[PDB]
Amino acid sequence: TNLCPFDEVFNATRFASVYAWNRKRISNCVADYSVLYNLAPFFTFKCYGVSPTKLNDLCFTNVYADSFVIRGDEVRQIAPGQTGNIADYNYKLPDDFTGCVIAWNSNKLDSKVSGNYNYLYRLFRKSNLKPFERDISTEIYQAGNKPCNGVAGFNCYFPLKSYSFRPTYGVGHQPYRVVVLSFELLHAPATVCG
Amino acid sequence: PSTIEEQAKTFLDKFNHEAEDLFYQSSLASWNYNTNITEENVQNMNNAGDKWSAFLKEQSTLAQMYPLQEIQNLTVKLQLQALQQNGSSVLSEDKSKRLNTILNTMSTIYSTGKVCNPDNPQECLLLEPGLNEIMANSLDYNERLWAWESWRSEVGKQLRPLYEEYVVLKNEMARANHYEDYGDYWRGDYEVNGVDGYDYSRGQLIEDVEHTFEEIKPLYEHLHAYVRAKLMNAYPSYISPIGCLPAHLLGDMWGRFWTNLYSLTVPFGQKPNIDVTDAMVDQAWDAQRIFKEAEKFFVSVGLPNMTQGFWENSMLTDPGNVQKAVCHPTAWDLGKGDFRILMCTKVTMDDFLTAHHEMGHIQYDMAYAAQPFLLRNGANEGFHEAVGEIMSLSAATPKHLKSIGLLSPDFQEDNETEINFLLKQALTIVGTLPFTYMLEKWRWMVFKGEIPKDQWMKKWWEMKREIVGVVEPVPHDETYCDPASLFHVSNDYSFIRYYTRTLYQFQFQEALCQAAKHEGPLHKCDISNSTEAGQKLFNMLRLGKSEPWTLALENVVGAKNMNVRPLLNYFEPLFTWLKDQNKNSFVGWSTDWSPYAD
Ligand SMILES: *[C@@H]1O[C@H](CO)[C@@H](O[C@@H]2O[C@H](CO)[C@@H](O)[C@H](O)[C@H]2NC(C)=O)[C@H](O[C@@H]2O[C@@H](C)[C@@H](O)[C@@H](O)[C@@H]2O)[C@H]1NC(C)=O
Ligand SMILES: *[C@@H]1O[C@H](CO)[C@@H](O)[C@H](O)[C@H]1NC(C)=O
Ligand SMILES: *[C@@H]1O[C@H](CO)[C@@H](O)[C@H](O)[C@H]1NC(C)=O
Ligand SMILES: *[C@@H]1O[C@H](CO)[C@@H](O)[C@H](O)[C@H]1NC(C)=O
Ligand SMILES: *[C@@H]1O[C@H](CO)[C@@H](O)[C@H](O)[C@H]1NC(C)=O
Ligand SMILES: [Cl-]
Ligand SMILES: [Zn+2]
């Protein structure tokens, strides 16, 4: 009956880069999901499948918390049936998605005047991602028809590009922190409730 | 199996990401200097600027290794071509260096050139503010003559050898990029290829400029005849009733605009003029309120408000006196959703209109920020300015001013205040059209080779007299280089853009005012509150330069080419008034009279 450690996910000092997104597995705890519906400025929430008020009286076996940072312009891609650099190459939600996506603006925390180069996203990849797949490889992307042998050059691109977060960017280019909640029901007993 | 077009697309995706970051650092570094002039900020501006230029030259060279001939997607081709123009880097390194030295020497001579009064060797004037204050405000014939002549004889004579070497090297650069000369290279800005129904050739711009200039001639001759008659009354011993206007009596250093002749030419000299400055002061407006009103203007036609960053990061007032700033009003698009205006705003009517003009640019910039980096511009070199200009047309009308409460409803508009307004407009807008065409025709002919070196100044003044109806007050031999005494000529900027802008702006204004269902003469039109006008404009603004400029123009005005009829439509009430005023005067000019031929 311990409380579900969502605080260390949402209030964490540094998020993952979206190409190397972080997943926290939740188990054996009670979560009060009505803790949301609150903190209205810049917290946005969108659930797929069942109302937040209604799942606070519901039990699941595992919950997963995926967190990362992206541009505001790109939050719309953290949603089922979307395309783009983020949904294709960094973090992909399945068509039949039954969870929630929380996002908030973190310009105060993730940008600085000299430019925050901490956060990366993958820009090139041979194929799109299967849902909930992660790719942290740093192999040189072969655009041309010559091998790259692991050095960047003509038609040989390092595939990870840095966001550049500065506090004077427009809202669409500012950093947003994103938390993605998946709920699953396997044969094993349920241990996450409300 | 990977095609060249697929390779190009991927190359441009990398370029777009890198370019946007490096450009933001350069633009912001430029901002910090222009708002806070310090030795430290010069360095940072030059460091970030140099990193940006170095990236561009590297990416231009890398871009050339993809052949255009093998690209089908036109929006990819357009981006590749724009980055592929290496320009000066087609010359040998020795000639690049020579040319860049020449450009720098011409620029600093223009901006540091000084003349000293031939009474005190140590009391000297620069062009800005010294000589410009004489040329816009003095009524004294000899003082103006001294400024006009010594500017061209002290500074212009310095630019003559440099300018000769500039033509040779710019032509070599142009010919090595397969243009026929530097003038043809400049006209390249209007070229459209490969889009059926919307193509436009470089040689077609000369034709359309000349064909439209013929239709402007009668309005210009009558404007010229009326101005000459009024100045003949002020200067009876200096002006011939059949000759050209002397070139030092036109209200600035070149006769580029005739704005400042208004006080000697105003048709109805006791009708109150419209100046809402006193009302703004009475109502306690500040810079904030002005920009709020201009924002209200664009919102009323369905365009977006300004971003939150615009209000926080712009500089709308002079920053006091500790920090110094470059106060020329400019609209800034830094990328990454960051838009700002720099303006040392005073509470006056001129700065109210200027705010609307400058915010018009921002509106253009915001609308095409969704295009890829290299397509984020006006559809051609004249579009951006035209968008700015039509905003101030609406904002200044009595209808708009009464509507926002700066003008008393009891202000009476009649025949005569409209004639005064139209005349003042014409002095600026129509008076510059022969100046602009004539100047660019001269450069075009010099670059083509049609004017030998030993006839440069001879052909310049023959064309001044014959096309512009203006005559030099002092004979000039070939040690002079009078065109280079104008900023754009010695600072290597194309000039026909001011001609095409002027025609575009009345084409736009006529189209929008029709969409706004405006009743009556075109010059009284205010497009405020018309979401149909705002949408029609927006459909062109969002294109940037992803489409041929001919198409972009069709979107707003339903025609594919530059057209003079809207300009003539705007000035028709003045034209018929001038035609009746001139019934006792000679219309036109003889080229053989001059102030010094006695
Ligand atoms: C020329 O290349 C463009 C970029 O490679 C194409 O735009 C892209 O088309 C994709 C179609 O599957 C679409 O998902 C992408 O979002 C889009 N990207 C951008 C930046 O627009 C373009 O294709 C045309 O434009 C888009 C908007 C769609 O309407 C397509 O159906 C169009 O054919 C390419 N143009 C041509 C003529 O091939
Ligand atoms: C994060 O911290 C704030 C302030 O301490 C708190 O109100 C909020 O509930 C915390 N988040 C969670 C998920 O507990
Ligand atoms: C102006 O620049 C100096 C150094 O370049 C800096 O210390 C100062 O804070 C700046 N002023 C403002 C208002 O930014
Ligand atoms: C711009 O207009 C929209 C529509 O009313 C509004 O929601 C938004 O807050 C406005 N922006 C600002 C900075 O006022
Ligand atoms: C625009 O609409 C508002 C609301 O009716 C009005 O107060 C304003 O005067 C209108 N402007 C014009 C030029 O009609
Ligand atoms: Cl001149
Ligand atoms: Zn402008």
Author numbering:
A (entry chain E): 333 to 526
B (entry chain A): 18 to 615
Give passages from the manuscript:
A detailed description of the Omicron spike and its interactions with ACE2 receptor and neutralizing antibodies is essential for fully understanding the infection and immune escape of the Omicron variant at the molecular level. There are 15 mutations in the Omicron RBD (G339D, S371L, S373P, S375F, K417N, N440K, G446S, S477N, T478K, E484A, Q493K/R, G496S, Q498R, N501Y, Y505H), with ten in the receptor-binding motif (RBM) for ACE2 binding and five in the core subdomain.
Here we reported the crystal structure of the Omicron RBD-ACE2 complex at 2.6 Å resolution. The Omicron RBD in our study contains the Q493K substitution, which was reported at its onset and was recently replaced by Q493R mutation. Three mutations S371L, S373P and S375F in the core subdomain are clustered at a hairpin loop (residues Y369–C379), resulting in a main-chain conformational change compared to the WT and other mutated RBD structures. However, slight difference in the ACE2-binding affinity was observed between them, and the measured binding affinity between the Omicron RBD and ACE2 is approximately 2.48 ± 1.17 nM, exhibiting a ~2.5-fold increase compared to the WT RBD (KD = 6.34 ± 2.19 nM). One is at the RBD 477 site, in which the WT RBD S477 is not in contact with ACE2, whereas the N477 in the Omicron RBD forms interactions with ACE2 S19 and Q24. Due to the G496S, Q498R and N501Y mutations in the Omicron RBD, newly formed interactions occur between Omicron RBD residues (S496, R498 and Y501) and ACE2 residues (D38, Y41 and Q42). Specifically, S496 forms hydrogen bond with ACE2 D38; R498 forms new hydrogen bond and salt bridge with ACE2 D38; and additional stacking ring interaction is formed between Omicron RBD Y501 and ACE2 Y41. From the perspective of our complex structure, the S371L/S373P/S375F substitutions not only changed the side chains, but also induced a main-chain conformational change, which would disrupt the specific binding of the antibodies to the hairpin loop (residue Y369–C379).
